[PDB]
Amino acid sequence: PQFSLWKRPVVTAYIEGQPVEVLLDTGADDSIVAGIELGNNYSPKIVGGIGGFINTKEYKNVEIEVLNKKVRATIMTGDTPINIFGRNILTALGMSLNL
């Protein structure tokens, strides 16, 4: 699957079985999701954007299913308007930017 960027590259993934829409982001070093419960086992992390900082709850070894593919990675959780799949997940999946 090849995505032209005319529209945002958005897909449906299941995080630990819960379905969500995520933006596949080659401009995010990290993945951050909002409104899903991931559990008690996390670490406070502080994160940056264009806008400014945000504090997140950091989950590791999270079961992800996206694009007919199974991965495990670090998910952070927080106040994010759109949910984002960064370069850590993208790499694990085998995606690439082409020209």
Ligand X SMILES: CCC(CC)NC(=O)C[C@@H](C(=O)NC[C@@H](O)[C@H](Cc1ccccc1)NC(=O)[C@@H](NC(=O)c1ccc2ccccc2n1)[C@@H](C)O)C(C)(C)C
Give me the residues that bind ligand X (CB under 6 A), please. 23, 25, 27-30, 32, 47-50, 81-82, 84, 86
Nearest-angstrom CA–CA distance, 64 and 73: 8
| Binding partner of 1, given a copy of itself, ligand X, none, CB within 5-8 angstroms per partner class | a copy of itself
| Binding partner of 3, given ligand X, a copy of itself, none, CB within 5-8 angstroms per partner class | a copy of itself
What are the catalytic residues? Answer: 25
Query: Nearest to residue 66, comparing CAs of 55, 75, 54?
Result: 75
88: amino acid identity, one letter: N
Whichever of 20 and 23 has its CB closer to ligand X, that residue is 23
Query: Nearest to residue 66, comparing CAs of 9, 12, 1, 29?
Result: 12
| Site for a copy of itself contains 95 (CB under 8 A) | yes
- CA quadruple 6, 75, 72, 68: dihedral positive or negative? negative
Residue from 24, 62, 73, 75 in contact with a copy of itself (CB under 8 A): 24
Residue from 14, 35, 48, 60 in contact with a copy of itself (CB under 8 A): 48
| Site for a copy of itself contains 12 (CB under 8 A) | no
E strand or H helix at 49 = none
According to DSSP, residue 57 is labeled E
